[PDB]
Design a protein around this nucleic acid. Structure first.
Lengths: 151, 151
DNA sequence: CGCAGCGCGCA
């Protein structure tokens, strides 16, 4: 079973980006309606989970110092993302940012489009068998977290 | 039951990002040891599944037609990744970008890497309770591959 | 403190 998991990891690595490629194509309309960019829906999304700093966002994907700040430099500018303390400076390491009601009603319009196409894709399933999936994926998740802590 | 389906996608959303971050904060190993920008790494993941062209490579994301072109040439004018016809001006239609020896030699390294971790991570499971999960997963992925046809 | 607004059809 040493060649087995290399597959289950290869599949996920497949099923994963087939969820990625989809999202983007399936969403492009509301990213031209809201005028952003993929590499921004993926940035918005992360705070649609809960508030983050710019220093907190960088570690997650690419360790781009401020090449990712030119990507939040637009985000705020388009009203979407809003600030920490309306007190004025030129400080960027201080502030923490969250989504404004505009980057929030984007999200309502986002998790409505997927909370359609997937509600379909799965409308025929056993729940006492889709939980038995959720669960297993909760663990491998949890684990993945109590390891996204350590080394 | 009309909503329960919701948390699942967000969860599945969440879940990748985690998986997405672990691979990154974990492959930042061989990434620099091959002198490659992180997201480039991503580009290679598909080319690993089959033969492919720049147009195709942009299909799994957004309008990065001359935006993911640097990305590929940064894997051409920089190591790994072959080209199709060792000489080509700029016409990317006669260009069919494949993989060089190390094009696997990297995927071959990275894979067994992100694997021992997934070998560890899951090891108290009877192959049976993972398998099930793999199936419902294989399905939801099929349904995606198809519904990724019309547009 | 490494780039952004462009190859919608081209035999």
């Amino acid at each position: 079973m040493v060649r087995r998991i290399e597959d289950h990891i290869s599949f996920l690595e497949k099923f994963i980006n087939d969820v990625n490629t989809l999202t983007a194509k399936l969403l492009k309309d509301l990213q031209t309606e809201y005028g952003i960019s993929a590499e921004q829906s993926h940035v918005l999304n992360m705070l649609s989970i809960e508030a983050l700093t710019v220093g907190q966002i960088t570690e997650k994907q690419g360790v781009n110092k401020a090449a990712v700040s030119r990507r939040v430099k637009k985000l705020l500018n388009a009203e979407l993302v809003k600030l920490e303390k309306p007190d004025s400076n030129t400080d960027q390491r201080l502030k923490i940012i969250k989504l404004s009601n505009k980057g929030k009603k984007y999200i309502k319009e986002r998790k409505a489009i997927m909370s359609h196409i997937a509600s379909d894709m799965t409308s025929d399933f056993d729940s006492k068998e889709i939980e038995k999936v959720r669960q297993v994926l909760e663990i491998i998740d949890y684990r993945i977290q109590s390891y996204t802590s350590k080394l």
